[PDB]
A paper describes a structure:
CXCL13 is the cognate chemokine agonist of CXCR5, a class A G-protein-coupled receptor (GPCR) that is essential for proper humoral immune responses. CXCL13 is an agonist of CXCR5, activating the receptor, resulting in downstream calcium signaling and ultimately the chemotactic response for which chemokines are named. As elucidated from structural data on many chemokines, this conserved tertiary structure consists of a disordered N-terminal region (6–10 amino acids, referred to here as the chemokine N-terminus), followed by a long loop known as the ‘N-loop’ ending in a short 310-helix, a three-stranded β-sheet and a C-terminal α-helix. Furthermore, we were able to utilize two of these mutants to solve the first uncomplexed crystal structures of human CXCL13. These structures allowed us to observe that the core domain of CXCL13 (i.e. everything except its N- and C-termini) is fairly rigid, whereas its N-terminus exhibits striking flexibility as well as a propensity to form both intramolecular and intermolecular β-strand interactions.
Upon administering both WT and Met CXCL13 to these cells in a dose-dependent manner, we observed that both functioned as agonists, albeit with differing potencies and efficacies. In particular, we found that WT CXCL13 had an observed half-maximal effective concentration (EC50) value of 2.49 nM, whereas Met CXCL13 had an EC50 of 26.3 nM. In terms of efficacy, we defined the maximum activity elicited by WT CXCL13 acting on CXCR5 at the highest concentration tested (1 µM) to be 100% (defining it as a full agonist) and our negative control of buffer alone to equate to 0% activity; our receptor-independent positive control, 2 µM ionomycin, produced a response of ∼119.6% relative to WT CXCL13 (data not shown). Using these parameters, we observed that Met CXCL13 had a maximum efficacy of 86.8% when administered at 1 µM, classifying it as a partial agonist of CXCR5. We were able to solve the crystal structure of Met CXCL13 to 1.88 Å resolution. We utilized the structure of CXCL10 [chemokine (C-X-C) motif ligand 10] to perform molecular replacement and generate an initial model that was then iteratively refined to generate the final structure. Further inspection of Met CXCL13 indicated that there is one monomer per asymmetric unit that forms a crystallographic dimer with a symmetry mate. We next observed the specific interactions that allow the formation of the β0 strand in the Met CXCL13 structure. One set of interactions are the typical hydrogen bonds formed between the β0 and β1 strands to create the parallel β-strand interaction and the four-stranded β-sheet. We also observed that the initiating methionine itself (Met0) was responsible for helping to stabilize this unique feature with both intermolecular and intramolecular interactions.
Residue numbers in the entry: 0 to 79
Write the structure that this text describes.
């Protein structure tokens, strides 16, 4: 899996947000676009293994919990 963070100032890419759980095993990439002057909200786009591309609510509990896993394994992926 690949996490991409775009430190850009472009217009919003998402017109809706989904809060539906996406199991990590189905995720090929996650793209995070922090908000800025181009888009007034943080966007999180999940690229699923079946090629679906899903804008996700960045305040959804399941994505927050996932992001904590990704943060804590960003220097070592060893499960300790």
């Amino acid at each position: 899996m690949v996490l991409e963070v775009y430190y850009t100032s472009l217009r919003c890419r998402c017109v809706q947000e989904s809060s539906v759980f996406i199991p990590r095993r189905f995720i090929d990439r996650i793209q995070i676009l922090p908000r800025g002057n181009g888009c007034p909200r943080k966007e999180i786009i999940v690229w699923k293994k079946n090629k679906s591309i899903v804008c996700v609510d960045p305040q959804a509990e399941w994505i927050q919990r996932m992001m904590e896993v990704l943060r804590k394994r960003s220097s070592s992926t060893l499960p300790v």
